[PDB]
Amino acid sequence: TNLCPFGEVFNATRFASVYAWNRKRISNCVADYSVLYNSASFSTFKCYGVSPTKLNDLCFTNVYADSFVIRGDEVRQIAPGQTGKIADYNYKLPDDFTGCVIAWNSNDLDSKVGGNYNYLYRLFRKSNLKPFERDISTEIYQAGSKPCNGVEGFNCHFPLKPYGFQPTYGVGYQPYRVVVLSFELLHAPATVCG
Amino acid sequence: STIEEQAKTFLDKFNHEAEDLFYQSSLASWNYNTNITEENVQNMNNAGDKWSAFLKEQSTLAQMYPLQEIQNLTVKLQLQALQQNGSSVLSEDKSKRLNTILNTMSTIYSTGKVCNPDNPQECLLLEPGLNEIMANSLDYNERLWAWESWRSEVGKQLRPLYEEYVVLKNEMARANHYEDYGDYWRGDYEVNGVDGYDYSRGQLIEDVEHTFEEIKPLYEHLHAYVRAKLMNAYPSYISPIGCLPAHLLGDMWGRFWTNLYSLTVPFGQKPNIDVTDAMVDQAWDAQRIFKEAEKFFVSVGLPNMTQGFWENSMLTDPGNVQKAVCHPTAWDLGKGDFRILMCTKVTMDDFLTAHHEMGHIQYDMAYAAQPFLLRNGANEGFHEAVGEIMSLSAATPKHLKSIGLLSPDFQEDNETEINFLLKQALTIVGTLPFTYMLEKWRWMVFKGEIPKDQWMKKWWEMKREIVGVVEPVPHDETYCDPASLFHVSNDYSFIRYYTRTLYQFQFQEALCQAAKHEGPLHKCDISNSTEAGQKLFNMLRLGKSEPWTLALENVVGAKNMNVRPLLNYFEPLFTWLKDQNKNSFVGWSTDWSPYAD
Ligand SMILES: *[C@@H]1O[C@H](CO)[C@@H](O[C@@H]2O[C@H](CO)[C@@H](O[C@@H]3O[C@H](CO[C@H]4O[C@H](CO)[C@@H](O)[C@H](O)[C@@H]4O[C@@H]4O[C@H](CO)[C@@H](O)[C@H](O)[C@H]4NC(C)=O)[C@@H](O)[C@H](O[C@H]4O[C@H](CO)[C@@H](O[C@@H]5O[C@H](CO)[C@@H](O[C@@H]6O[C@H](CO)[C@H](O)[C@H](O)[C@H]6O)[C@H](O)[C@H]5NC(C)=O)[C@H](O)[C@@H]4O[C@@H]4O[C@H](CO)[C@@H](O[C@@H]5O[C@H](CO)[C@H](O)[C@H](O)[C@H]5O)[C@H](O)[C@H]4NC(C)=O)[C@@H]3O)[C@H](O)[C@H]2NC(C)=O)[C@H](O)[C@H]1NC(C)=O
Ligand SMILES: *[C@@H]1O[C@H](CO)[C@@H](O[C@@H]2O[C@H](CO)[C@@H](O[C@@H]3O[C@H](CO[C@H]4O[C@H](CO)[C@@H](O[C@@H]5O[C@H](CO)[C@@H](O[C@@H]6O[C@H](CO)[C@H](O)[C@H](O)[C@H]6O)[C@H](O)[C@H]5NC(C)=O)[C@H](O)[C@@H]4O)[C@@H](O)[C@H](O[C@H]4O[C@H](CO)[C@@H](O[C@@H]5O[C@H](CO)[C@@H](O[C@@H]6O[C@H](CO)[C@H](O)[C@H](O)[C@H]6O)[C@H](O)[C@H]5NC(C)=O)[C@H](O)[C@@H]4O[C@@H]4O[C@H](CO)[C@@H](O)[C@H](O)[C@H]4NC(C)=O)[C@@H]3O)[C@H](O)[C@H]2NC(C)=O)[C@H](O)[C@H]1NC(C)=O
Ligand SMILES: *[C@@H]1O[C@H](CO)[C@@H](O[C@@H]2O[C@H](CO)[C@@H](O[C@@H]3O[C@H](CO[C@H]4O[C@H](CO)[C@@H](O)[C@H](O)[C@@H]4O)[C@@H](O)[C@H](O[C@H]4O[C@H](CO)[C@@H](O)[C@H](O)[C@@H]4O)[C@@H]3O)[C@H](O)[C@H]2NC(C)=O)[C@H](O)[C@H]1NC(C)=O
Ligand SMILES: *[C@@H]1O[C@H](CO)[C@@H](O[C@@H]2O[C@H](CO)[C@@H](O[C@@H]3O[C@H](CO)[C@@H](O)[C@H](O)[C@@H]3O)[C@H](O)[C@H]2NC(C)=O)[C@H](O)[C@H]1NC(C)=O
Ligand SMILES: *[C@@H]1O[C@H](CO)[C@@H](O[C@@H]2O[C@H](CO)[C@@H](O[C@@H]3O[C@H](CO)[C@@H](O)[C@H](O)[C@@H]3O)[C@H](O)[C@H]2NC(C)=O)[C@H](O)[C@H]1NC(C)=O
Ligand SMILES: *[C@@H]1O[C@H](CO)[C@@H](O[C@@H]2O[C@H](CO)[C@@H](O)[C@H](O)[C@H]2NC(C)=O)[C@H](O)[C@H]1NC(C)=O
Ligand SMILES: *[C@@H]1O[C@H](CO)[C@@H](O)[C@H](O)[C@H]1NC(C)=O
Ligand SMILES: [Cl-]
Ligand SMILES: [Zn+2]
């Protein structure tokens, strides 16, 4: 009858980069969602396809928390039907979603003097992402008809560019840690409840 | 697949590396300018080298996208901005020589001192030594010594360097498919592609010349007034119908006649409006000044200064242990980083400077939404006009009264308005012919209309005809008086000062109609008019994305430069001048020389 490890996800020392976003499966536990919502700590907490008040009064077969780091400006892209480098190439939410997006400013945890280059994002991709599709390939972007030959050059670009995360950056260019709650219901026993 | 599509993706990668490097480099510059240490100088330079090396590589790559193949204008213009090689259009050794001459005349200007042979150990440098004499000395002979010995000692060493500089700049401009290096400079104002908003490099000269002829009546009345005041002070040195001697104009070159105020003030018994004491009596500090400027921009419906501006800016001289460059600047490092570097004192002059520099940060924030390259003022004249119209509104006694700095006991004496407007005219109206003639000469020098054996012969033909100023000593072709000025010997376009002067009055005139201001334009304060702030913002948010003609039209309802508002600002002074010159000769005769009696 133990509580779900939400602190393990939300209080992780280091978060994933958005292109290679991390997914954790929460199972066999009692999830208290009011603990997560009633906090005021997060700069965003939005639930789609389901009310957050009725979450405690429901059982699912599994829960998935998808964590990562992006800029302040890009936080509006972690929503259904949104566009831009992140929604398009990094993390895509289905146009019709059922879950929650919880995001908070982590300028204190993720932006060092001189720039934190541990956090990357994909700038180019030959196709838009499908909902929940992850891409971790470091293959050279062949912008032109000319074969790249595994080398950076003209019309050949490295698809991954870093957030130079510095503490003096403005809020829209600052790190924001994002956690996305997905709910799953299959013809199988309901492991998570309230 | 298409060249346009490939250049769009190249610009993406470019905007993300440029934003990064430019930030790191700007941070190195901030650290040196705020904490002048040998370590910080070293790190500032390595960043400058990296940034240059980066843009070199990026220029070579941009070159590889044929402009002809792009239809998209904002992409085509962004690519064009990158493609200019500048110096590398010349040979390795020819580019090395150009950089050498450029370095040298810069060094001679900043380090050239003039010794009094009586004391060989003591010499005067232009800053502060010579500049102080030209702005404070009332002794006719002292001023002449400083004017002449600067040109004779330093202005003569620059002469052979300038000749080589002109020929090398012209060869570089020819390769960039401009006719001359002046045509290249005029390229800033050029607009092509956008029908109705197009602007040619040739049009600029026509427009500066037409507007200038409209300034000629006010300027003639101003010059004649000043010549009358100066003639009283130095009676046996000035002719009532001739030019004004170059060494008697308030500064080393007579760029602006502001320092002549001491000798030309209409109402000497009437005091000045200087809220300095009021700030000290109300216990104001550098923080209250910047918080009052913020209130001004918020009242016009503009954003409050960012939280990072408050923590990261240096708005005060840093005590006594770490040295800092105290030139008031507005920094925009990118990535939302906006700072102001100003060693602020509790004075009215610093209070007004807070508005100017904070206006620059407001312009910076507005176009910060644009792609990296297009984050600049519409043309070279634009950004400086914006900061200036803020200090205009902040200096009005109407504004001062509302902010509590000016006592309501201040009654608007129209004598103080004439003292104010004349001091303004001395700076603004007085600099226009100087700025025009200097660039007119420079443009014709590149054009090939003035041979080397005529350079000085014509420089003083033009100073007497256009500006109405005469040299006190005959200067032959061994001298180089144009180069003895910063911008000329440091390779800087000067027309920006003419254009931006006309722009700021257009801007104020438009925003003051939006602010529903009634009465004299010089008394207008645009505070609390969010309609004026919206009018101004419409252009500020544009940056360099759209043509300056359209940017201007978004504010003033006109695609072109206009004298009418500048003349409108100074119309009460002009009627006063017209009255005071009733018994004087207005205009000048070129044949009178002080040295030739
Ligand atoms: C040439 O070339 C060029 C280049 O390429 C081009 O241009 C381009 O284009 C494009 C288009 O798309 C664009 O894009 C866009 O953008 C925008 C902006 O952004 C920006 O900003 C922001 C802030 O604000 C930020 O965040 C971001 O990040 C950005 O930044 C920056 O920017 C700049 C400028 O732009 C750039 O440059 C840079 O780079 C950047 N940066 C980076 C780093 O990158 C945006 O917005 C968009 O988006 C989209 O999506 C979204 C979602 O996600 C949406 O959203 C929305 O919004 C709105 C507002 O606006 C809202 O509302 C509001 O909100 C608020 C809050 O916020 C409140 O709430 C209120 O109350 C409200 O009201 C809403 O709500 C939202 N929504 C939601 C749901 O949420 C938007 O809108 C958008 O959408 C859409 O999109 C589309 C596309 O995709 C479109 O459609 C279409 O398309 C096509 C194509 O494809 C065509 O175009 C057509 O026509 C169309 O139609 C639409 O329209 C839209 N919509 C609208 C409305 O509009 C995007 O992203 C870009 O940017 C540009 N660039 C420039 C420079 O500009 C051009 O075009 C060419 N040319 C020609 C002539 O063509
Ligand atoms: C004026 O000016 C002057 C002159 O300049 C000054 O002085 C000086 O300065 C200097 C600079 O310049 C300083 O520093 C020094 O140096 C060094 C170096 O570094 C730097 O530089 C470099 C160049 O050269 C650069 O580079 C590079 O980079 C890279 C990247 O990219 C890196 O890598 C990295 O590494 C790491 C480790 O290390 C890791 O691994 C990572 O991951 C990676 O990435 C590299 O390393 C580099 N290189 C090299 C060679 O290094 C860099 O970046 C930089 O920039 C340094 O290192 C040192 O330092 C030291 O010290 C300090 C003290 O002071 C410490 O600590 C600190 O503290 C502070 C306070 O005070 C803090 O802050 C804060 O924090 C927080 C957080 O925590 C936040 O952020 C805030 O906001 C802030 O404010 C900080 O943080 C800290 N730091 C850190 C890092 O964190 C440090 O740490 C160090 O030490 C240390 O300690 C510890 C404890 O604490 C221990 O444990 C350890 O062991 C140690 N280590 C060592 C090495 O030592 C040096 O010193 C100096 O300092 C100065 N001085 C004084 C007195 O301070 C002045 O200052 C000015 N002034 C004004 C007023 O401005
Ligand atoms: C605009 O003005 C700038 C002023 O510097 C000029 O910039 C330099 O231009 C030269 C060429 O004139 C560049 O020289 C070399 O570029 C090479 C890149 O191409 C290579 O690879 C392709 C195949 O992919 C071959 O076809 C080609 O022949 C070359 O072999 C590089 O090998 C070198 O650049 C390297 O510079 C430094 C080291 O010095 C490294 O850090 C970089 O990673 C980079 O690889 C080589 O120097 C030179 O790169 C340009 N300068 C800089 C600093 O990048 C422009 O040339 C001028 N405009 C035009 C059109 O010439
Ligand atoms: C938006 O920019 C404005 C600057 O114009 C800032 O708002 C101002 O914040 C100060 C905080 O001290 C408020 O001061 C108050 O003054 C009254 C007297 O007028 C005093 O009695 C109070 O105790 C207090 O000191 C000021 O009223 C307020 N003005 C307005 C109109 O909001 C602020 O920095 C910016 N806000 C944001 C959200 O960024
Ligand atoms: C721009 O708009 C602001 C806000 O409307 C104006 O501020 C107001 O300024 C006046 C003084 O000029 C303040 O009046 C004072 O009121 C108190 C009490 O009512 C009284 O005791 C004082 O003697 C004085 O009359 C008023 O409080 C102040 N209001 C705010 C919210 O700041 C400002 O004057 C306008 N500026 C311009 C140039 O239009
Ligand atoms: C680890 O997770 C817990 C729960 O999510 C965080 O608890 C917060 O504690 C502070 C006081 O330290 C309270 O003000 C908040 O209201 C608590 N939040 C919640 C949701 O209970 C805890 O701070 C996290 N630890 C770190 C270091 O981030
Ligand atoms: C201007 O100043 C003079 C000062 O002698 C005064 O007589 C006159 O009435 C004032 N007003 C106008 C509009 O001339
Ligand atoms: Cl001269
Ligand atoms: Zn300025």
Numbering used by the authors:
A (entry chain C): 333 to 526
B (entry chain A): 19 to 615
What does the paper say about this structure?
We previously generated two SARS-CoV-2 spike proteins that each contain six RBD changes that were detected during persistent infection of an immunocompromised individual infected with a SARS-CoV-2 strain containing the D614GS mutation. To determine the impact of their combined mutations on human ACE2 binding, we generated recombinant RBDs for the day 146* and day 152* spike protein mutants. (B) Day 146* RBD–ACE2 ectodomain x-ray crystal structure. The N501YRBD substitution is found in multiple VOCs; once it surfaced in the immunocompromised individual, it was retained at later time points. As also shown in a cryo–electron microscopy (cryo-EM) structure of the SARS-CoV-2 spike protein containing the N501YRBD substitution bound to ACE2 (33), the side chain of Y501RBD interacts with Y41ACE2 and K353ACE2 with no notable structural change. In structures of Wuhan-Hu-1 SARS-CoV-2 RBD bound to ACE2, E484RBD is near but does not directly contact the receptor. In the day 146* RBD–ACE2 complex structure, the K493RBD side chain reaches over the RBD surface to recruit the E484RBD side chain to form a new salt bridge with K31ACE2. The nearby Y489HRBD mutation, which removes a polar contact with ACE2, better accommodates repositioning of E484RBD because the histidine is smaller than the tyrosine side chain and would avoid potential steric clashes with E484RBD in this binding mode. A second rotamer for residue H34ACE2 forms additional RBD contacts to fill a gap created by the reorganization of local interactions. This structural plasticity may explain how the RBD tolerates an unexpectedly large number of mutations during intrahost evolution yet retains the ability to bind ACE2 tightly.
